[PDB]
């Protein structure tokens, strides 16, 4: 039975690959050839948010585009006021090994997690004045790699174990669980409509899930190595990825295949983060080499470089407003570029 | 007014500095090892579905945070990136075992990791007493797993522990060499391995960890000050 079933799987895989071949009448470079290149993009560090003691392992902008939470391996979440660099909060984490942090879209909550396998929810607006652990979402059997709020009550998380899960914060239960990967799920990105989210894993495959139904809809496998970063194109029909193989890929949900790949053979460092600009014309990416490259999303070439960090760039985020970019690093500084 | 916000920011900065003082004075240690090894009892020996277990212990008035990784997936390629820039890695292996080849592969992967290339390993060859009675038993012929042991002799620079058989010393130092030759192959002076033979109950395990951390910090400052 096993051989026959695996051959049936191979047959369906061949059908999918042939469909992708048929849909590949042209490449993005052919379509975009007529368009005007962005030129030399140059950005300067407008703010340098210092105060973290250890590697800044994650960051996330608030929807207000001014406040940004930032997780450090020393066990601190600092909510920064980027406009003035004031520290609005300094939340002492229970587990020092925090690998991710999220900012609720309403700004009421922040989440964080890591090697503790527990996603702690923090309430920023309690009557008591301080910041307290609203919930401790436990149930993962591996380190928490990423987490993103759908709303103040629903949070979707990825784990070092094979699974990715959706939680209800009121009860602390898993509303649904996602399976289908084989390696560690390394990143999440939430679609603007919040009905879909895409996750990359150590198996070098990116999978599109539906939160409402709890199943994988389609899979993408254009990477030779594991995927460390993932981000949705603002339109919500395409998403970029970053891998240890040091090249980004752009995938389209409706075309069900890769559209473009960004690489420069002298770049051999893996990619740690990815993010589109508000228009989607720029595709910023962080690298194990201590700088970020601003790729032009439509014409795959390095439009600029953000070289201002003394160590690995670990996180990167463009404000929902799009005014500025923020990058964290293992040197324990966040620098806002614009 | 925003001036009150700036005052709050400065108070938070003061608290962050007070936390930094504690952070720098403490030495972080990552405890790794195969399940058959006694790391789980070594942590419990400290006399001071969750993941990181944090053990706090102090020797000669310097603090130590030993992290046992607990529940994770089998392969550690990714999450061990976090444990960069720890003071040292305490890799614990069961010498009485054959799991020895698996432990050697596991130490090869840890040692040659691209991120742990500046982290010295305080290698613990745990369960030396079980190894002793396993060698004296004779039935467990280590040679059939390691044919090289048929043609190995204890080196001139080795010193036997008081009251030990020649065969047990030969076997234990052979295992020591089997780890040391992995350590020497790829470490270009950036990180060092410190083998030890231990039983989990030894009160000297913490003392050995303290002395090795002393040497590791000495080397770190020596390289920082351009003396090497």
């Amino acid at each position, epitope marked *: 039975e096993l051989d026959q079933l695996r051959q049936e799987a191979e047959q369906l895989k061949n059908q999918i690959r042939d469909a992708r071949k048929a849909c590949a009448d042209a490449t993005l470079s052919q379509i975009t050839n007529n368009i005007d290149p962005v030129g030399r993009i140059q950005m300067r560090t407008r703010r340098t948010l210092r105060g973290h003691l250890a590697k800044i392992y994650a960051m996330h902008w608030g929807t207000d585009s001014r406040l940004l939470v930032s997780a450090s391996q020393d066990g601190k979440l600092i909510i920064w006021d980027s406009y003035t660099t004031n520290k609005v909060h300094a939340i002492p984490l229970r587990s020092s090994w925090v690998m991710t942090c999220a900012y609720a879209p309403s700004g009421n909550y922040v989440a964080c997690g890591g090697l503790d396998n527990i996603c702690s929810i923090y309430n920023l607006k309690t009557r*008591e004045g301080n910041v307290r652990v609203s919930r401790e979402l436990a149930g993962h059997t591996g380190y928490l790699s990423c987490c993103r709020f759908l709303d103040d009550n629903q949070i979707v998380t990825s784990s070092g174990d094979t699974t990715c899960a959706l939680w209800d914060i009121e009860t602390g239960q898993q509303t649904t669980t996602f399976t289908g990967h084989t390696g560690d799920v390394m990143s999440l990105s939430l679609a603007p409509d919040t009905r879909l989210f895409v996750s990359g894993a150590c198996d070098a495959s990116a999978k599109l899930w539906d939160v409402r139904e709890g199943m994988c809809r389609q899979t993408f496998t254009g990477h030779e190595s594991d995927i460390n970063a993932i981000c949705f194109f603002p339109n919500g029909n395409a998403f970029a990825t970053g891998s240890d193989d040091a090249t980004c890929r752009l995938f389209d949900l409706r075309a069900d295949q890769e559209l473009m790949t960004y690489s420069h053979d002298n770049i051999i460092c893996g990619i740690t983060s990815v993010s589109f600009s508000k228009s989607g014309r720029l595709l910023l990416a962080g690298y194990d080499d201590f700088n970020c490259n601003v790729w032009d999303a439509l014409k795959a070439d390095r439009a600029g470089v953000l070289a201002g960090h003394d160590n690995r760039v670990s996180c990167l985020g463009v404000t929902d407003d799009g005014m500025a970019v923020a990058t964290g690093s293992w040197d324990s500084f966040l620098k806002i570029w614009n | 007014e925003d001036k009150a916000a700036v005052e709050r920011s400065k108070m938070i900065e003061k608290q962050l500095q007070k936390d930094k003082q504690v952070y720098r004075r403490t030495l972080r240690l990552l405890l790794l090892g195969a399940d058959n090894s006694g790391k789980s009892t070594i942590v419990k020996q400290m006399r001071i579905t969750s993941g990181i277990f944090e053990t706090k212990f102090q020797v000669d008035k310097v603090n130590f945070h030993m992290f046992d990784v607990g529940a994770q997936r089998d392969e550690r390629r990714k999450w061990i990136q976090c444990f960069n820039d720890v003071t040292a890695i305490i890799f614990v292996v069961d010498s009485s075992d054959n799991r020895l080849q698996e432990a050697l592969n596991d130490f090869d992967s840890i040692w040659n990791n691209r991120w742990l290339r500046t982290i010295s390993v305080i290698l613990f060859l745990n369960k030396q007493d079980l190894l002793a009675e396993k060698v004296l038993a004779g039935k467990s012929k280590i040679e059939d797993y390691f044919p090289e042991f048929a043609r190995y002799t204890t080196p001139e620079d080795a010193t036997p522990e008081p009251g030990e058989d020649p065969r047990v010393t030969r076997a234990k130092y052979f295992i020591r060499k089997e780890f040391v030759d992995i350590s020497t192959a790829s470490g270009d002076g950036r990180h060092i391995c410190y083998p030890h033979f231990t039983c989990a109950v030894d009160t000297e395990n913490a003392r050995r960890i303290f002395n090795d951390c002393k040497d590791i910090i000495l080397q770190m400052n020596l390289r920082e000050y351009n003396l090497v």
Partner: single-chain antibody, 228 residues
């Protein structure tokens, strides 16, 4: 969340007293503390302020040096020592909570208050001291400022309080547009930066009271009564 004051009573101008308040149910250390006096048949007056961590202190001109404000975070107690009293000091004294950061709501909570019996600033003017009204109909409370409150940073520092008879003031709107926690949607705020408005669309039976405008570039308005 409770702020209970201690002291008060009879004083002759040749005497002295210490006002005290105890904080319960919240992190007193993080909050800056204000003292606000409710003089008999009069509006509110700001007395003194001490920031979080005691790093900043301010006093009213009438009281600058005449009284001294103190604070003990470990015991969650706020003190206001009154060295030389005079007739102007007779009033009910409220300890007022406040915290300052982006998006915070200063003056969110007011203490129960204690009464003391005794033998340039931005002048705030409210449209009228009283307005007959009935529940269910909309009404607008209006006030004007000595100068524009629209600070360069891009927000207007105006606060609207409702002192229900027999109760401490409640914060309705802070920074001219933001409803405070627990405030029903009935209320709303608007302003041009130098003239300001507070609208209650569907006045409830519980909305009876005096409405106080305040600026925080501290001065309160004369208070507008809604005679139900």
């Amino acid at each position: 969340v409770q702020l209970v004051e201690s002291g008060g009573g009879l004083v002759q101008p040749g005497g002295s007293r210490k006002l005290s308040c105890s904080a319960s149910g919240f992190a007193f250390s993080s909050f800056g503390m204000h003292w606000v006096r409710q003089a008999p048949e009069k509006g509110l007056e700001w007395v003194a302020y001490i920031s979080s961590g005691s790093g900043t202190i301010y006093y009213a001109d009438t009281v600058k040096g005449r009284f001294t404000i103190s604070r003990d975070d470990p015991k969650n107690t706020l003190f206001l020592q009154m060295t030389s009293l005079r007739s102007e000091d007779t009033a009910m004294y409220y300890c007022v909570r406040s915290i300052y950061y982006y998006g915070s709501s200063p003056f969110d909570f007011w203490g129960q208050g204690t009464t003391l019996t005794v033998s340039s600033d931005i002048v705030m003017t409210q449209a009228t001291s009283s307005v007959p009204v009935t529940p269910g109909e909309s009404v607008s409370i209006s006030c004007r400022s000595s100068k524009s409150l629209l600070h360069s940073n891009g927000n207007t520092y105006l606060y609207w309080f409702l002192q229900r008879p027999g109760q401490s003031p409640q914060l309705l709107i802070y920074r001219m547009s933001n409803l405070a926690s627990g405030v029903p949607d009935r209320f709303s705020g608007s302003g041009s930066g130098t003239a300001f408005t507070l609208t209650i669309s569907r006045l409830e039976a519980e909305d009876v009271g005096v409405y106080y405008c305040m600026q925080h570039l501290l001065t309160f308005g004369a208070g507008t009564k809604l005679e139900l």
